[PDB]
Structures are given as structure tokens and as C-alpha cells.
Design a protein around this ligand. Structure first.
Ligand SMILES: CCC(CC)NC(=O)[C@H](CCC1CCCCC1)NC(=O)c1ccc(CNC(=O)c2cnn(-c3ccccc3)c2N)cc1
Length: 341
């Protein structure tokens, strides 16, 4: 066990190993209760998140366990990973606080598009890295579900990582129509719809579908992709949903070349394959990596899949102290990543 030291920052008690120095809060609460710190073992800047009221309810306790499980799993270049996890507690009985350590990322894409309209080369490289991380996540049967520019972090070298900061940029603007609506018939490709919306915004400098609500959002979407045909209508099981869709005056699919005018036609083609209403016909991440648009980056020998992830906990209903105990187990069993850098 290492030696901890205590301090206070902006309303909150922080107790961390001497290893981590010079804590400075970042983001004004936009990312949680998070500090930049200097890690004395590597000489690298890191981010330290202290979880807020991790075991306050069964729901918090489960969310805490879930976040720690997901973070301990993620071992890929384009996905946030876990550098360390600790608590000042010496025993389960004392266990009340969870701290997570990750790399400190430079800026999010919300900032980087709200600066400029990117070059086609920058778009290629950023979307390629998103899809490479998604291939990995998806291969473990994990769905992100909340992809949007503020959940992607990029460093000065343009290296990108996928994260989820949790609850400016509305989620609904990037969300696939099938989980705007029924939340019933959906696959991993809900994340590919989000990548299509992100890529459009990078190319044009404008949010593709800036809806005010779920109805408006859907209206904007149908105006681009057109109203469902009989084949897609065949597969909507919700009567209310189906009634609403068919209630609208029918709309044709736009020619995406006339919408994204002047863009690389290969970018336009990929967007046609990502922004399809029918989720069974939407391109997967693994397929998108082989698309000609990424010819300069794609290497099929360097697009790894993940180890399997045991999500079986998700279907369990346990007590607070049980989720807490499990979370403690996971803190204890943590094996830090190689230092080599
Ligand atoms: C917390 C809510 C919950 C909602 C679901 N989500 C999670 O469970 C995921 C877990 C893993 C996910 C799973 C899906 C794929 C992406 C990773 N959890 C994280 O992604 C997660 C993300 C971050 C952290 C701690 N690090 C920071 O806060 C941090 C790092 N750099 N910067 C920075 C960025 C730009 C400029 C300046 C500074 C920060 N602010 C710790 C966990």
C-alpha cells in the first residue's frame, strides 16, 4: 500500500497516493470531479477522476461497478484506458471512494470543429481512428450509444480516443433514428449513424441534424434520408411509430453528392453507407475500415478485436453492499499496464 496525502479542491476532499502531484481541477465540472496531475512514476501528466457518491443507491453502485469493469477491459489505442484505480480505504468496511486515473487528453472534437472546418486528410484520419476503436468495442459486444464530438478526445498529434464523459452538444443530434424512437430493434450500428453525423459535421462545419426534440430530430433526418419504404416499414413492430411515420407526407432520399457539395466523393459514398435508415443495411465498423476512403490508413493486420467481455452482471439485481463488494474486488485485482513508453 502506498502513502496517501490529503487536500481539498472546490468543495471536495481528495486523498491520493504521493505518486500523483500538483492536482488542478479541469473543465469546471464538465467532465465530473476531475484533476490534472503529474504522475511521478512516469513523469507524464494524467487525469484523476474521483467518483461522486459512487455507492449512494443501488443504481449508483451498479453504475460505478459498470464504469470500472468497462475501463479495466479497454486495451486499445483509440479507446480510453485505465492507468490506475485506487481508494484510500484499507478494508471493504472503510471502502467509500473510488478514484480513476487515465491519460490526460488535449481537447475534444467539439472544440476542434468549433475552431475550423478540417481538411479531408484530417477527416480521413480522425474518422479512421473512431472506426478502429469501434471495431474493437463492438467486437466485445459493447455499444457506445452516446457518440458525439465532446466524447472524442484528440491530442496535438491528431491521435484520437473514444470515451464517455456522461451527463452545448446534444446527444439527440447524433442519435440513430431507431433508438430515438422505439429503442427495440437496434444493433451495434447505432454507433455508425453517430459516426456518419460526426463526419458530416467535420466536413461541413455544421451540425447535420440539429433537432430541437425527438420529433424535430426525426423530421430533419427524414428530410435527408427520405421516409421509410415498405421494406423498412415491414420491420417496425411499434404501431404508434409506424402510424406516425406513415402519417407524414412521403419524402425522397436526397442525393448526398448534392448535399455535401465539393466533398471528396469517397467521403460522400461512405456517408451514404453510414446514414441509412435501415440498421440491417448500415455499414459496420469493420466493413467501414476497408472502405476506399481510408486507403492511406487501413491496415487489416493492425485493427485488433477485443477479448470477450462478461456483461452477465448487467442482468443482475443486487443490493448496494453487494455491488460495492464487487467493485472492491475489481479495485484489488487491478494489474497496472506496462510502463514502456
Ligand atoms: C462516466 C459516465 C459513463 C457513462 C456511460 N462513462 C463510462 O463508463 C466510461 C467507461 C468506458 C467507456 C465505454 C464505451 C467506450 C468508451 C469508454 N468512462 C469514461 O469514458 C471515462 C472518461 C474519462 C475519465 C477520466 N479522465 C478525464 O476525465 C479526462 C482525461 N482527459 N481529459 C481532458 C480531455 C480534453 C481536454 C482536457 C482534459 C479529462 N477530462 C474516466 C472515465
Amino acid at each position: 500500500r502506498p502513502t496517501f496525502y490529503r487536500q481539498e479542491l472546490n468543495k471536495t476532499i481528495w486523498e491520493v497516493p504521493e505518486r500523483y502531484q500538483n492536482l488542478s481541477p479541469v473543465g469546471s465540472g464538465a467532465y465530473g470531479s476531475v484533476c490534472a496531475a503529474f504522475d511521478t512514476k512516469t513523469g507524464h501528466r494524467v487525469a484523476v477522476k474521483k467518483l461522486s457518491r459512487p455507492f449512494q443507491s443501488i443504481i449508483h453502485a451498479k453504475r460505478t461497478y459498470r464504469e470500472l469493469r468497462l475501463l479495466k477491459h479497454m486495451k486499445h489505442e483509440n479507446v480510453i484506458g485505465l492507468l490506475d484505480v485506487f481508494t484510500p480505504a484499507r478494508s471493504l468496511e472503510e471502502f467509500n471512494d473510488v478514484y480513476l486515473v487515465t491519460h490526460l487528453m488535449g481537447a475534444d472534437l467539439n472544440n476542434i470543429v468549433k475552431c475550423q472546418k478540417l481538411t479531408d486528410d484530417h477527416v480521413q484520419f480522425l474518422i479512421y481512428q473512431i472506426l478502429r476503436g469501434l471495431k474493437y468495442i463492438h467486437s466485445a459486444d459493447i455499444i457506445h450509444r452516446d457518440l458525439k464530438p465532446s466524447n472524442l478526445a484528440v491530442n496535438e498529434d491528431c491521435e484520437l480516443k473514444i470515451l464517455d464523459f456522461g451527463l452545448y452538444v446534444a446527444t439527440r443530434w447524433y442519435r440513430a433514428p431507431e433508438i430515438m424512437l422505439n429503442w427495440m430493434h437496434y444493433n451495434q450500428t447505432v454507433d455508425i449513424w453517430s459516426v456518419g453525423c460526426i463526419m458530416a459535421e467535420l466536413l461541413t462545419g455544421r451540425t447535420l441534424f440539429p433537432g430541437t426534440d425527438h420529433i424535430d430530430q426525426l423530421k430533419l433526418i427524414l428530410r435527408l434520408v427520405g421516409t421509410p419504404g415498405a421494406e423498412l416499414l415491414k420491420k417496425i413492430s411499434s404501431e404508434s411509430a409506424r402510424n406516425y411515420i406513415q402519417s407524414l407526407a412521403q419524402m425522397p432520399k436526397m442525393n448526398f453528392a448534392n448535399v455535401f457539395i465539393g466533398a471528396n466523393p469517397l467521403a460522400v459514398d461512405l456517408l451514404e453507407k453510414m446514414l441509412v435508415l435501415d440498421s440491417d443495411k448500415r455499414i459496420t465498423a469493420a466493413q467501414a475500415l476497408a472502405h476506399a476512403y481510408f486507403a492511406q490508413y487501413h491496415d487489416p493486420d493492425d485493427e485488433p478485436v477485443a477479448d470477450p467481455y462478461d456483461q452477465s452482471f448487467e442482468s443482475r439485481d443486487l443490493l448496494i453492499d453487494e455491488w460495492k463488494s464487487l467493485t472492491y474486488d475489481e479495485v484489488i485485482s487491478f494489474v497496472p499496464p506496462p510502463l514502456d513508453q
